[PDB]
UniProtKB/Swiss-Prot annotation:
Organism, scientific name: Homo sapiens (Human)
Effect of C104 to A/S: 95% loss of enzymatic activity
Keywords carried by this UniProt record: Cell membrane, Disulfide bond, Endosome, Hydrolase, Lipoprotein, Membrane, Methylation, Prenylation, Protein phosphatase
Residues at which substrate binds: R110
EC class: hydrolase
Protein's cellular compartments: Cell membrane; Early endosome
Main location: membrane
Organ and tissue specificity: Mainly expressed in cardiomyocytes and skeletal muscle; also found in pancreas. Consistently overexpressed in colon cancer metastasis.
Gene Ontology terms: cellular component: cytoplasm; early endosome; nucleus; plasma membrane
Protein name: Protein tyrosine phosphatase type IVA 3
Activity regulation annotation text: Inhibited by sodium orthovanadate and peroxovanadium compounds, and by pentamidine.
Amino acid sequence: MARMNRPAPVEVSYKHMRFLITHNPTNATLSTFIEDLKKYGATTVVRVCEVTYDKTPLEKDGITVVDWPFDDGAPPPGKVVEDWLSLVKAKFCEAPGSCVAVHCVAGLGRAPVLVALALIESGMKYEDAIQFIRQKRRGAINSKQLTYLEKYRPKQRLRFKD
């Protein structure tokens, strides 16, 4: 509860999706924050982070609550995937190609790491995708991530792959 202010988030439109990365680490009022994702046309809360509060406002606003330990920590490369596709599959299956508000720090690792997971499941090649997010950032997804998808197989969650 504070109102006022004019926070300008970041909307990222993909092949057939659209997310909203919060420039700053959540809002100290929430009110203004909810309006930001609500005005941008995003039917999803940037709860994608170290959230620890019950959704009261965004809840009655009919906005999809996206709460995930995407902000440091979180489980290994294999569990989070479930929420990844699920969310991106819900926010879009619940709203008309609306946007998905998610919380993010600076990017790096997670940046390409997370996006990579959804990218591949979207129907993109692991190698190709990697080279992309990798060429735009030395050692972006490299690590357990690369090896993970190397052995991991796409269940065709987000459309058809390969």
